[PDB]
């Protein structure tokens, strides 16, 4: 639904990027998040691309996808309005201090399941929607620790083929999921000891893979390893990942 800029009461900034910034906001009493595009080119081609993007978001409806709630479609305030997740990015949540005590194995496995559900949903659109930029910093977490894929750089989550500048693949983000599941199970930062360029070489050309603790749950380790096969088409679909994760959380 269309939203007039004046109807938004902007609050404290909660994020930012290339597009611009993100701010919590009050909207007719409702608590929302507003993505404010700062670019000052309001010519048709751009406004139209924006409108086109907004029409896509309107069609994406799933519990584990950030809830679209509206859009400011009038210059000079092009914006996307969504629900507000108060715990922010998954990345910061895992690496903040005390995370291990704050989040038990069962919870972190549920968080993984949430992502798999979102991605399974996205992969089943016609045409399928592939998120090659899938990564923990892109995932958002609400108060109840539910995780949602934010659908609207650095390569530690990019699949080898992507790092090789190869053609787009539907199973590229399955590799990325493998890294996210690894972060969740180990609470380690991926490739913390390499610079971006070294990551590209390691995973893209030397078939290096993040090390799995011998101490880790075998069933979770298996899910991870399967996501990391060099042959993309050999990686399990997200629905298969869901089947494999469901026994564990329960």
Domain CATH for 248:
1.10.510.10
Number of H helices and E strands in the chain, helices first, is 9, 7
Q: Are residues 46 and 167 in the same domain?
A: no
HSE-CB of 49 using CA atoms within 13 angstroms: 7
Q: For residues 220 and 102, what is the distance between their CA atoms, to the nearest angstrom? A: 20
- How big, in percent rounded to 5, are the helix, strand and coil portions of the chain? 40, 20, 40
Q: Are residues 228 and 117 in the same domain?
A: yes
Q: Are residues 165 and 186 in the same domain?
A: yes
Q: Are residues 151 and 60 in the same domain?
A: no
Q: For residues 143 and 159, what is the distance between their CA atoms, to the nearest angstrom? A: 31
Supply the angle between the helices 105-123 and 172-186 in degrees, to the nearest 10.
170
The residues, any chain, with a CB within 8 Å of residue 54's CB and separated by 6 or more, are 71, 73, 80
> Token pair 């972190």 is at which residue?
108
Helix (H, G, I), strand (E, B) or coil at 145: coil
Contact 105/95 with Cβ under 8 angstroms?
no
The residues, any chain, with a CB within 8 Å of residue 107's CB and separated by 6 or more, are 145
Q: Give the E-state strand segments of 77-150 in sequence order.
A: 79-83, 139-141, 147-149
In this structure, how many other beta carbons lie within 10 angstroms of the beta carbon of residue 35? 21
Residue 3 gets which letter from DSSP? Answer: -
Q: Are residues 201 and 78 in the same domain?
A: no
For the record, the structure tokens of 26 come out as 């009050």
Q: Are residues 114 and 166 in the same domain?
A: yes
Experimentally, how was this structure solved? X-ray
Signed CA dihedral, 202, 139, 59, 26: sign only? negative
Q: For residues 107 and 195, what is the distance between their CA atoms, to the nearest angstrom? A: 31
Q: Are residues 75 and 114 in the same domain?
A: no
Q: Are residues 8 and 129 in the same domain?
A: no
Residue 89: beta bridge partners? 140
Question: Could you list the residue range(s) of the whole structural domain that residue 127 is in?
Answer: 87-250
First to last CA, the chain: 38
Nearest Cα to Cα of residue 239 among 161, 171, 146? 171
Burial status of residue 240 (CB atoms within 10 A of its CB: 0-12, 13-18, 19 or more):
middle
Residue 20: beta bridge partners? 37
Residue 5: beta bridge partners? none
In this structure, how many other beta carbons lie within 10 angstroms of the beta carbon of residue 101? 7
β-pairing verdict for 139-141 and 147-149 = antiparallel
Q: Are residues 174 and 234 in the same domain?
A: yes
Q: Are residues 76 and 98 in the same domain?
A: no
Contact 25/58 with Cβ under 8 angstroms?
no
Q: Are residues 113 and 210 in the same domain?
A: yes
Contact 69/82 with Cβ under 8 angstroms?
yes
Contact 7/28 with Cβ under 8 angstroms?
yes
β-pairing verdict for 79-83 and 139-141 = unpaired
Q: Which of 61, 86, 111 corresponds to the end of one domain?
A: 86
Number of structural domains found in the chain:
2
Model resolution, angstroms: 2.5
> Token pair 């893979």 is at which residue?
209
């Amino acid at each position: 639904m269309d939203i007039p800029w004046c109807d938004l009461n902007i609050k404290e900034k909660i994020g930012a990027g290339s597009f611009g910034t993100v701010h919590r906001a009050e909207w007719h009493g409702s608590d929302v998040a507003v993505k404010i595009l700062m670019e000052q080119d309001f010519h048709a081609e751009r406004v139209n691309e924006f409108l086109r993007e907004v029409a896509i978001m309107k069609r994406l409806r799933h519990p584990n996808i950030v809830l679209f709630m509206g859009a400011v479609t009038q210059p000079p305030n092009l914006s996307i309005v969504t629900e507000y997740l108060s715990r922010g990015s998954l990345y910061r949540l895992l690496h903040k201090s005390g995370a291990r005590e704050q989040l038990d194995e069962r919870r972190r496995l549920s968080m993984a399941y949430d992502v798999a559900k979102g991605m399974n949903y996205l992969h089943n659109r016609n045409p399928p929607i592939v998120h090659r930029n899938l990564k923990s910093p892109n995932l958002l977490v609400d108060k109840k620790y539910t995780v949602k894929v934010c659908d609207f750089g650095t390569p530690e989550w990019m699949a080898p083929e992507v790092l090789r500048d190869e053609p787009s693949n539907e199973k590229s983000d399955v590799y990325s999921f493998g890294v996210i599941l690894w972060e969740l199970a180990t609470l380690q930062q991926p490739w913390g000891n390499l610079n971006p360029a070294q990551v590209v070489a390691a995973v893209g050309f030397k078939c290096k893979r993040l090390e799995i603790p011998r101490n880790l749950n075998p069933q979770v380790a298996a899910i991870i390893e399967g996501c990391w096969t060099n042959e993309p088409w050999k990686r399990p679909s997200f629905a298969t990942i869901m089947d494999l994760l469901r026994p564990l959380i329960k």
